[PDB]
Design an enzyme around this catalytic site. Sequence first.
Site, PDB file in Angstrom:
ATOM      1  N   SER A  39      41.989  35.309  36.822  1.00 51.06           N
ATOM      2  CA  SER A  39      41.211  34.263  37.421  1.00 51.06           C
ATOM      3  C   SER A  39      41.286  34.581  38.858  1.00 51.06           C
ATOM      4  N   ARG A  40      40.134  34.908  39.486  1.00 55.11           N
ATOM      5  CA  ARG A  40      40.144  35.542  40.778  1.00 55.11           C
ATOM      6  C   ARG A  40      40.769  34.686  41.840  1.00 55.11           C
ATOM      7  N   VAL A  41      40.427  33.379  41.887  1.00 49.02           N
ATOM      8  CA  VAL A  41      40.931  32.484  42.904  1.00 49.02           C
ATOM      9  C   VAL A  41      41.615  31.304  42.281  1.00 49.02           C
ATOM     10  N   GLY A  42      41.963  31.392  40.982  1.00 52.54           N
ATOM     11  CA  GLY A  42      42.434  30.261  40.220  1.00 52.54           C
ATOM     12  C   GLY A  42      43.655  29.554  40.737  1.00 52.54           C
TER      13      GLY A  42
END
Lengths: 62, 468, 50, 56, 499
Positions: free
Chosen positions: E366-369
């Site tokens: 999740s790239r910016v999770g």
Amino acid sequence: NVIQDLYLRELKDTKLAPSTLQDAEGNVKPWNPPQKPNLPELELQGPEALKAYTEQNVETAH
Amino acid sequence: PITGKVTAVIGAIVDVHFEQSELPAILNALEIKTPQGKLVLEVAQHLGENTVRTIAMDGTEGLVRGEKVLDTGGPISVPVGRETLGRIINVIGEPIDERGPIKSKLRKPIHADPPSFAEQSTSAEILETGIKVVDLLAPYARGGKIGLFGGAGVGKTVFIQELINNIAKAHGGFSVFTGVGERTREGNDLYREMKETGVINLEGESKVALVFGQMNEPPGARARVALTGLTIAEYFRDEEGQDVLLFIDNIFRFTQAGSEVSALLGRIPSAVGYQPTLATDMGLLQERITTTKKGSVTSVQAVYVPADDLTDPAPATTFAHLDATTVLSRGISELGIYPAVDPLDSKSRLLDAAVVGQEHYDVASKVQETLQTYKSLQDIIAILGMDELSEQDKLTVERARKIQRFLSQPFAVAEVFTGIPGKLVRLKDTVASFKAVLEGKYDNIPEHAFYMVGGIEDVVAKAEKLAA
Amino acid sequence: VRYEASLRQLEQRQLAKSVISRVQSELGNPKFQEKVLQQSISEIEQLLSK
Amino acid sequence: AKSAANKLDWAKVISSLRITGSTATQLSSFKKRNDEARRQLLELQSQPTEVDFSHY
Amino acid sequence: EVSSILEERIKGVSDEANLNETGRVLAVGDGIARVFGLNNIQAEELVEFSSGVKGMALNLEPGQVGIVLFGSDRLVKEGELVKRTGNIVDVPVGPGLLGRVVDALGNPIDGKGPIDAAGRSRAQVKAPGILPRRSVHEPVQTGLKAVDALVPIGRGQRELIIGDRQTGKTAVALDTILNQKRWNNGSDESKKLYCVYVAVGQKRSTVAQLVQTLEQHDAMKYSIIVAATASEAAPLQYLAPFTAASIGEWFRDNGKHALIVYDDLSKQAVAYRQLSLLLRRPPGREAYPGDVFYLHSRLLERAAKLSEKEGSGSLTALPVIETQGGDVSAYIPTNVISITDGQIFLEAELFYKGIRPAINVGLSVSRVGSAAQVKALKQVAGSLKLFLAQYREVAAFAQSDLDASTKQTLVRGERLTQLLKQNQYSPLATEEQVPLIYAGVNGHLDGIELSRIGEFESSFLSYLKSNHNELLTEIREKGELSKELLASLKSATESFVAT
């Protein structure tokens, strides 16, 4: 509309009489009567069993 | 009247020029009177200029450009009824059983819009079957499409026959064996055999109605066989309220027929050759099968996976539609188990904890676990020896092997065929059968005394005589 | 309750085809002429409303 | 009571653990357990015992 | 009754209309029609046919206009009169769509009531610019522990969910929708998501069961369902995600938080493919058209966490990709992966092998999770992703000599894996998830033998509430762990472990 007139007339002059009670019955089995399975089986009837059991039972291991 | 002259016959794709302001509509049926009979053409385009482009459903050979054609006015309307029971009917809706004109009640267009979202049945139901293996690990469901996979003529046909026998008990419904791309040789066998096993009585009751669609029939007509069969079913479902079961032959050959029709229509083929309208066409076929308020069709399909590639689009699209898969195997049949069904291989989405209740589920899970462990264990147990079984391990090996024989039960249809009296065991009694075996109540009884037997209660008796 | 709902649907389709039957009857009549006249004067009114 | 039955059952198990007091006592315990387990599912099995006629 | 309703329908269709233009169809078939006239047509207008169906004009050519039939080929025929709707393709949007299944045009296919909609809005609309966007800061909780810290997800965030066909793929998303009732049936409207479930290319029967499932969990009242079933025509399917995204935008542009699950975009690909091929545009790679990238990208980028200026709108996108034959390098999936931020790959082997659902975390990113996560669920879960990517390594090379250190990691790892596991339609509260992860991280699952891990979870939770739900209330409100909370949890966890 000519339709509006047509409908009004049609509806009034053509009345569907409700379906026979038997046909309704055909699609739905009617009522359910009291379950009534009455008396079930006797529970540990008589001391006849008891006398047998007192005499029989002595088989207890250490 | 509505007439038009044939203005092309490039392949079986016949372009017809109709007199102005009388033009057909898409999916209408046109009939060309011929000394061959009729040719039924289905309008699949309007080319403008008071011309259409139609496809044919009968062989186009010898046709002369300029024959008058007459327009039925809509998709082919096939007779349907209770009279259609036990009649072999071709795709153009005419008897090929040669028992003469079927006594038509109503006829109905082959294209029929799939039932509304509103009229969908909100929850699934379990269509009872007699087969215990089925009834535990992949219970049949009402509405559903349950796709058979496995061998062919290994008893495959007989398995289908068994289902017909069962259906008569289960509801008393009807069936329609629809065969798409069916070898005419194989068809002869099916008709004679079906008569013989009495699911067709030409002088009496017939549950199954037959629709046989040979491979020699035009690719378009091969494509339309399926829709015709479904129409028969809908008369049963909608207009007799019945829950019915419709068999289809290769749905690979359904796909194959469709791909060809697209190519004939000149559409750019989609991946791996299959029609660009692959999804939608299958979609119409497999959404006209469901549980309506009135009744429910249920469909058993045969999936002849090409190259055994489950990655292939034709299988993939099928698998999307399928609810359960029954995976008959010849290895299992070679273990002497009839049902041919390989239990571990079969997988269902109709087997679910909520659906069959926790008890049925728990019993099933245990039966799966026992068999699953048993098979894997038996691999090296066979090599290593049974002495290298632990007490726990030989308990499973024992339990599993008792289940393994116990799974097999004769089939009523194959009462003659194996020679052994059929066993049709009710769904409730199936659960009971496995519960007891799980509790190993009667597990101490010989394996051959559990071989080819009915429910647990039944095999208590058989065990005594067999042992004695 | 199910049969009751079903009966409403059955009633609806029976009464639907009775409307169709009445439609087939009206378009035969010289209502076919007289209502065309009604359309004619209505088209006059409509076309004047442009 | 059922709570009495089970506390005394397991008490008798740990008494039999020492000097065995079970031989066919445990078979009696099994029978009472059976029907006792039936009663809890019976009590859970119960739904309203009268037909609905307010709404229905 | 039936008479009154019919009479009502007739009264409701009384009176004529002022028609002002038409075109007439010339050639039709292959689900596209070529119409003569309509010189006043707007580009991408909606036209209504004489048949009654609607279509979107696609090719405006000097001599012909080529409508695309939004289903129904049977009814359309040559020399029919096509009248301009006069509007670019729009769909009713509004608050009242809550608790209404609708098809693409906005016709309730559940047929529950007539449409209640604030507006109608054009199907294609420009995406939020860079300038009106503001980064994510609020979490979305799915009640699946692995998801809620190992694959963290926020609001207004695109986050792909990818995996193999009918593993109850839908269920993974469904659980999120259900879990959202602790804010959706939760009072706080500054925490209310309004969630849209787009069902594309799915069995109409199955969807009806799903709808019934949602109505069983009484969740229908906080949710909208858009439906474009398998039966429903391919052009309708093409317009189906776009229309759904419009519905979502009305909530978003109220500033309200929302979520949209586009299940399955893989079926949209097949639809656009069909459409393109029938428009005889050159076949792209894997026969998926060359403009397929644009199709997904335009759809995907219309969801987003807007800025404070825009009233901090959010539309959380979860697009669900069905990997055909489990091919994770397939053309459509890779194209989607590049567009999406993070993916939640699910592993078939694990699914069969005893997790239902089985969320593979090796191939889930999740790239910016992690920035949207609750501080408590960052603290307790600190490095657990790393740890379980040490477990991943450990079991890679386990199959060989094992150091006691390696064994310790293996024992923690395997046991942690057991803890992750959860069963369908059984979600866990945010508060509840914090101690469970605390335990495992603090290595208390070395303290629990593998068999009894499940017992530990339920018992631990019951224990915690009974011991002190005060702590859980603190973690519920504070949402972070103070030194006291950390100690209190250490003490409490040790306390449960003993019993």
